[PDB]
Design a protein around this ligand. Structure first.
Ligand code: KWM
Length: 636
């Protein structure tokens, strides 16, 4: 009951977090009975909020709906409600407020960017009674949540998956926004480059082998600490190649051992043939041979020699059959045939899709450092279109679109941000404020010739983090037809490319929309390069693959098409972050850390600042809530 509320809030139901210990020292340093009371009040407040997340949960309502023993202690109930409200656990997203906001606002914060992190933080700060204004360069909210919508067609070009609702804040937001989520059928038939499907024996074998290889790299990293070699950090791709070479060595070793067994039995057979020839000569001899006594004795010893040859003939046959057994039971000649390796490269391209980067750039030690925090439940797609979330979040906010920030100024007295109009650069705007929250993408912050200048410049630790972390790329191609010509029973199907270099070109197709829309991914090394190809040609290659799969007559010419180019998009410069070889999750922590020129003035949220949930919409959401809590603590 109330135990599940804490789980859904990413918290232990029977323990106190470090943060709670900090904010409630009299309770941890006090008797355990008071701790259990505190924990029940917290869990029950969370449950009240999650049972009905469309209305604000007030201190008064919590007191009223609390059970007999606990509704008496109003001071501790208030402390708990205030703590939860400040940190974005009970009053976040879009809810109807019971009492309108005060007219006098007690602080001025400029938020750079109108993505999920910016909008979440802005909504929180506005709830807290501060003056919030969002500056966004695009002509739309959402940032890397971007939904193409035309006629009946709806298709996401940025984020498109919610990754299990157990513990996921998106759950709440879904209920608040009326997101139409649909779980993903995990059936993904692979089709070779010729167009014929991969039979399931081969599909299953290669998937098993891929998982074994990945687990092998993990064993290399953590138990054997095969982490830095020749004064360079090992990439995941490096360790994968190491593992594959080890298995190929095992293959040729077992091959050579079998070869040697065969050769020794061949030599045994040869010397037995020779010995047999010799005794055939000796019986040949003795056959041409008291005289009756002598013929008795010569018949005697020819009997002897013939039974000896019989022994040898039995042995000849026995070893001939051992030879035949080993001629007919050889082990594998190679570890992976060409088609085997192409299917393995498809699985590698799936990993490169997931991490938005080629495997040769991921930190072997830390590429999956966030796995312990993954939510429970099936993965789902957004049928309504993910853009519903940010635009719902935008309602009632002071958001100036087409306003590109180019200089941010922070000093011990105040803050200046300077922006230009994307529509007519001539006109310039200057905003003074008390604090600046920067949700600029890590790609924008990485821009070697800076799009945005910081005055004073950002410190060495922050810039070093910005350069160490990885910022990947991933692209989508949307095709909109008039008739569904694929299997509706399947949400995904793979295309196995020809070469390792281009394994990620149009390797995965999604069918996740009510209209007849197919969505093709471009991952790894192909993702950046093919941004330089025109839409007509990329669509021609998509159509060629689909014709090979379904029949040249079966697939029509598409009515509508859209191609993302996220690395060239100047407001993103890639898809999302990843743990590059030199980096670690500490770097994410350093991205979240704020800057003081005294009190802090420049704050940081976004997908690249949450250690435990990076590269995700919900990561951006949680980081927005967290930075809003921090700023409110500092200025209220
Ligand atoms: C193409 C693509 C696809 C996906 C994902 C990205 C992309 C690019 N993600 C990434 C996700 O969107 C981001 O993690 C999230 O949206 C981050 O939100 P942020 O607020 O931190 O970053 P934004 O870019 O959205 O907002 C920054 C704002 O600042 C604006 N801006 C830039 N420069 C300036 C400037 N000078 N001045 C003012 N404003 C500026 C900019 O226009 C933008 O609006 C997805 N996030 C996600 O949860 N689930 C997904 O399935 C997507 C991916 C995924 C990731 C992890 C685990 C499972 C799945 C897989 C993919 O299919 N979904």
């Amino acid at each position: 009951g109330v135990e599940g509320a804490a789980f859904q809030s990413r918290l232990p139901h029977d323990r106190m977090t470090s943060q709670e210990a900090a904010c409630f020292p009299d309770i941890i340093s006090g008797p355990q009975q008071t701790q259990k009371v505190f924990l029940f009040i917290r869990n029950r407040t969370l449950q009240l909020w999650l049972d009905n997340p469309k209305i604000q949960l007030t201190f008064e309502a919590t007191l009223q709906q609390l059970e007999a023993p606990y509704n008496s202690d109003t001071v501790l109930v208030h402390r708990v409600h205030s703590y939860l409200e400040r940190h974005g656990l009970i009053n976040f997203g879009i809810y109807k407020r019971i009492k309108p906001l005060p007219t006098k606002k007690t602080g001025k914060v400029i938020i750079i960017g109108s993505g999920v992190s910016g909008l979440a933080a802005a909504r929180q700060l506005q709830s807290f009674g501060m003056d919030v204004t969002l500056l966004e360069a695009r002509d739309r909210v959402g940032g890397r949540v971007a939904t193409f919508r035309k006629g009946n067609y709806v298709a996401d070009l940025g984020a498109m998956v919610v990754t299990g609702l157990g513990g996921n804040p998106m759950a709440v937001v879904s209920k608040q926004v009326n997101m139409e989520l649909a779980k993903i059928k995990q059936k993904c038939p692979l089709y070779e480059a010729n167009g014929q499907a991969v039979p399931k024996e081969k599909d299953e074998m290669v998937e098993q082998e891929f998982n074994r290889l990945l687990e092998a790299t993990s064993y290399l990293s953590h138990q054997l600490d095969f982490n830095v070699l020749n004064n360079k950090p090992v990439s995941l791709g490096q360790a994968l190649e190491v593992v594959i070479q080890l298995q190929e060595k095992h293959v040729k070793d077992e091959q050579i051992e079998h070869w040697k067994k065969i050769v020794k039995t061949q030599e045994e057979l040869k010397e037995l043939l020779n010995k047999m020839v010799n005794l055939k000569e000796k019986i040949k001899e003795l056959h041409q041979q008291t005289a009756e006594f002598l013929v008795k004795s010569k018949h005697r010893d020819l009997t002897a020699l013939c039974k000896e040859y019989d022994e040898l003939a039995e042995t000849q046959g026995k070893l001939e059959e051992k030879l035949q057994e080993l001629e007919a039971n050889p082990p594998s000649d190679v570890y992976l045939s060409s088609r085997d390796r192409q299917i393995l490269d498809w699985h590698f391209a799936n990993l490169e899709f997931a991490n938005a980067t080629p495997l040769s750039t991921l930190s072997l030690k830390h590429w999956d450092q966030d796995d312990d925090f993954e939510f429970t439940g099936s993965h789902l797609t957004v049928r309504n279109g993910y853009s519903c979330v940010p635009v719902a979040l935008a309602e009632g906010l002071d958001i100036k679109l087409n306003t590109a920030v180019r200089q941010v100024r922070y000093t011990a007295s105040g803050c200046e941000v300077i922006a230009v109009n994307t529509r007519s650069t001539s006109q310039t705007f200057i905003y003074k404020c008390d604090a600046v929250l920067c949700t600029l993408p890590l790609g924008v912050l990485k821009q070697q010739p800076p799009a945005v200048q910081f005055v004073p410049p950002l410190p060495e630790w922050k810039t070093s983090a910005v350069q160490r972390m990885g910022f990947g790329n991933l692209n989508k191609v949307v095709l909109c037809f008039d008739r569904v010509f694929w299997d509706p029973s399947v949400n995904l199907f793979g295309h196995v490319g020809s070469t390792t270099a281009s394994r990620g070109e149009l390797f995965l197709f999604w069918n996740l929309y009510k209209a007849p829309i197919l969505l093709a991914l471009v991952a790894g090394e192909a993702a950046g390069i093919m941004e330089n190809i025109s839409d007509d040609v990329i669509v021609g290659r998509c159509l060629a693959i689909l014709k090979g799969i379904f029949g040249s007559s079966a697939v029509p010419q598409p009515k509508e098409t859209v191609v993302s180019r996220w690395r060239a998009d100047p407001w993103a410069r890639g898809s999302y972050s990843y743990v590059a070889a030199g980096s670690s999750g500490n770097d994410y922590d350093l991205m979240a850390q704020p800057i003081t020129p005294p009190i802090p003035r420049l704050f940081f949220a976004g997908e690249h600042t949450i250690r435990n949930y990076p590269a995700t919409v919900h990561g951006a959401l949680l980081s927005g809530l967290r930075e809003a809590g921090r700023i409110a603590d500092q200025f209220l």
